[PDB]
Amino acid sequence: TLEKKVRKGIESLITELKLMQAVLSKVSKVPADQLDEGVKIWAGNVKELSYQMEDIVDAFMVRVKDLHRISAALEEVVLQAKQLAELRQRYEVDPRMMALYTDVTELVGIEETRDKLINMLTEGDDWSKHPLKTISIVGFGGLGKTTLAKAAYDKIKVQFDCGAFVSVSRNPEMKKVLKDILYGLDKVKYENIHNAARDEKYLIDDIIEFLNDKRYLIVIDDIWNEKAWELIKCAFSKKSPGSRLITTTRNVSVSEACCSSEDDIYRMEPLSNDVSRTLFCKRIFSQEEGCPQELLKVSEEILKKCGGVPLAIITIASLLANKGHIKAKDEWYALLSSIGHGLTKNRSLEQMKKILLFSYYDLPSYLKPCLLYLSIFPEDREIRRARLIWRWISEGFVYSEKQDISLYELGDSYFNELVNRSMIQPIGIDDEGKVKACRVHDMVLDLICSLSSEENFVTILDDPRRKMPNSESKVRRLSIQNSKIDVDTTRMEHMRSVTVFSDNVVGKVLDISRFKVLRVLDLEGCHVSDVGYVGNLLHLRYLGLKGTHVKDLPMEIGKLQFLLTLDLRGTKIEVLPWSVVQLRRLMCLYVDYGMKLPSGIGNLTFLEVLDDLGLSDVDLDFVKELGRLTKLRVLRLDFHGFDQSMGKALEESISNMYKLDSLDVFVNRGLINCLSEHWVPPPRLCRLAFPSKRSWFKTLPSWINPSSLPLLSYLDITLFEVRSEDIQLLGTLPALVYLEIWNYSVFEEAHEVEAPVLSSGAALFPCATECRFIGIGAVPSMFPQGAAPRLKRLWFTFPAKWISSENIGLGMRHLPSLQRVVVDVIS
Amino acid sequence: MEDIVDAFMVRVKDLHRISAALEEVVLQAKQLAELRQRYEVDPRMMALYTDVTELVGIEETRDKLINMLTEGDDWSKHPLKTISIVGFGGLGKTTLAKAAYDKIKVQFDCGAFVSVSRNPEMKKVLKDILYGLDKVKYENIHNAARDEKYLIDDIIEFLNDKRYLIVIDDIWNEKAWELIKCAFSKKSPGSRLITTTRNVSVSEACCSSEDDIYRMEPLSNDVSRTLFCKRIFSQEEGCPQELLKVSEEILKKCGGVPLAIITIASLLANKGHIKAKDEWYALLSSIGHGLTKNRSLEQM
Ligand SMILES: Nc1ncnc2c1ncn2[C@@H]1O[C@H](COP(=O)(O)OP(=O)(O)OP(=O)(O)O)[C@@H](O)[C@H]1O
């Protein structure tokens, strides 16, 4: 009856959504420089309609009284889209080229870095008989990559026969690039080469035939989208000893497509603090620095902001001193406040903003919003990547149709794709084995915040900013920050998300239940426990309550039929309500071992990651129940009171799981009567940790074999005894990037540190960067340096009575950077 | 709409439902109309520049081809003849032609390796033929734009009293080739032509005799095994001993196309057999339903 017309209109809305998203993606490709203002205004209005109809369709999906409301809203938004239609019909060089021409005696700190680039390629030019090699230089935004290549280039040209710079832009024309290569080789024979119009191929043949019996040193820079470089590499495919190539790029996934060797990849780092200070004082300051003595702290704090990027500091210095330091200690602070939120809205600085937006424009779709989402988080802090992944999934930024992907690995791939585009610095390694958190450069972060605020993507309340938009109704994302004064929340009815950063004003001034529709709720670090209204929120996906003093949670959580996250670390709650099996969709459950889980967990079939499951006073059915739901990828378990044949029951029921990637079991000072020696492990596994040290195994587990579980890269194992064949067996394993073994009896009984030996094989360690042995003697005279090619640190124990022995054959420099080690010695 | 029409035509009470469906289908047609109005290099070219000492099995077929066209070179007074090579997808038809071309080249006075696309521009093709014949006299021939005719005459006059061995590959739509044939119409004994195409029905448009049409066949199982192991493995195939069965089964699906084998060998060795017995089963199972949606496989 009435349901049929709305059920029919919904997919019409969906088709319109697809068309609008297509045109929005097309119009956002062009830089906001060639795009006329009329098309841009129309695009903004289209974007607003896009949000409104997404909200209507989502309301329909979650709800199905209300049908009348949905129908009325649908007719209204149709009228709006119609009316917007006829308005539109009714009313209708490279910025970095100059840098290339800069005075040589204007670059500070260049010579040493240039020498490092030269002698990593010309060391084989001595005996220039080696096969040709390419040296790739990587970096982010602009930090000397092209200049350094030219300094090196202009230095070593007497000892070759040819050579040229060629640049490749964002969207090259291959014939143009090839004509540029031909022109630079010889400008006489190929003087009018840009007029000849053959093809992409005959001129490749000509360039090949030209470079026979010659050493040249061709350098190509700014190569993006590796598929473009696979054309040029065919021009360089005949044997030519003593010839070399240089490549510069912002994509670190294209550099390994060159030179096939990680030692040839040149990661280059920002300038050091003192070098950056010297450059900064060379531009503004004439010859001395001892005059101010009052803005020195200001210069320190400014140089900290730019970090090390020769570009940022060059631009800021040019802005700061037009003629004899036209500004002093007041507008310096005004600039400092302006950066972070609004610095770029200025003059002579917009030059560099295009150089930074190059990378943002090169991003494909489905990644522009993911990058723009970073504007939510504050200026300088590490951002846990798991938080970003779950927030992205809950927001709707991640989606697919393949059904062979668990929609989480997809988000991880998006994050890694952001990393390799040289836009966010990854730092640290988490407990799951991947990047822990990420940090974004200060200039880039402030620049993207402005770009996001050009539309209504987010809204930030900041004391330095202290600014509000004119339309309170059209607010979707809010980021409360240190500001705690103007907390008006009246006319934000369709609020997509909200998050609060370390504020005690929350709750007493905030009223969140008033947000009838809400998709994620993030409450890191707050001190509020009054959660009794989340039952009213039915669109919620992400609910973060880490460190929130939440003592208890409402019984009616089961109503939140759509839900994907519950983070409950650091909370005061110790028992979950029974109304949690009622949840049908979930992917993560971050709980601590103290809390007690109600029975019925086996119904949460869609669960993807489980963390810190406490097994205390558990019956057999509950232990067996975890095995029916097989979608886990990460599982963390600890226990105190079930150490019986139930252990073997669980150990067998785990093997039902076929998608694990990590595992770790925690137990106090006991033999592991859980893992049985006749049991198949999951086919896929990477981490397999065991962080307890008071615990031990009697023997090396039998199921540990090179045959099964071939993808391991981490052990953290501990055993009572040790054998000289166990180490050899561990050497049969393929990857095992990380190594750690503990000898329990050594630290607990009167046991002597013996010297195990690898008798069989040659290397048994192709790739193990880290190796740790505690209570086990790993003498470095176990094999010549041709055994473990990559091993940055090694730990072992050396008894003092072996000083007089002859088995201590160290002193030679092994292949990896193994000259830093402090071995624990025992008398 | 076509379902509505067929329903009416077969049926002729149903008039009421048919009419209702008619007006509502008109409704979606109109609605979609205004909804729409509201909003407004060759992959196989790089393969040509591949290392010679990587091909496996080219010599036997290449020697057979050379002596089936060069057999009359002794007493080089036989009239010119053409050889068509027929195949599907990638079976080195182009590579084999170049392998033969690079060997018997010193014993001709001219020669050109010229390609034709799906939709050729005849002026471009003939300019390419001219440029390959002599790169000095006809250096900037691609700039000059006379017509389809005078440059054909230029070719004909240039090919007076010479033996050339011109090879033209990837001819589709024989109506294209019958224009090129007029370039080679004067008697020129001791000179020959080589033609490749994925369309067998345009080969009998060439050479007018079945004995010259060269059907070419996929690789044998042994040669396919050698090429498959040479790309992935280091030097010995008997080292794994445990994915050998998976290897032969996955090789059976490619059959003998040096292409499928080359793509699978590249995709299956990212860095020294990235994993075994699991991803190889993934690629065996992924044939049929989703293997195409993958990475660096789109190039084929
Ligand atoms: N050591 C240095 N001393 C002084 N100025 C420098 C130094 N290195 C770079 N610059 C200047 O900083 C600007 C950075 O441009 P650069 O040549 O680094 O671009 P790039 O590294 O190729 O980055 P992009 O990939 O964005 O082109 C240029 O003006 C350059 O001259």
Ligand SMILES: Nc1ncnc2c1ncn2[C@@H]1O[C@H](COP(=O)(O)OP(=O)(O)OP(=O)(O)O)[C@@H](O)[C@H]1O
């Ligand atoms: N016998 C061989 N040994 C090794 N590699 C080969 C062999 N034959 C072809 N290849 C490789 O496989 C691909 C074959 O290209 P091919 O010559 O088949 O194109 P083609 O026959 O003209 O077919 P298409 O109709 O696709 O153009 C190239 O990558 C070639 O290098």
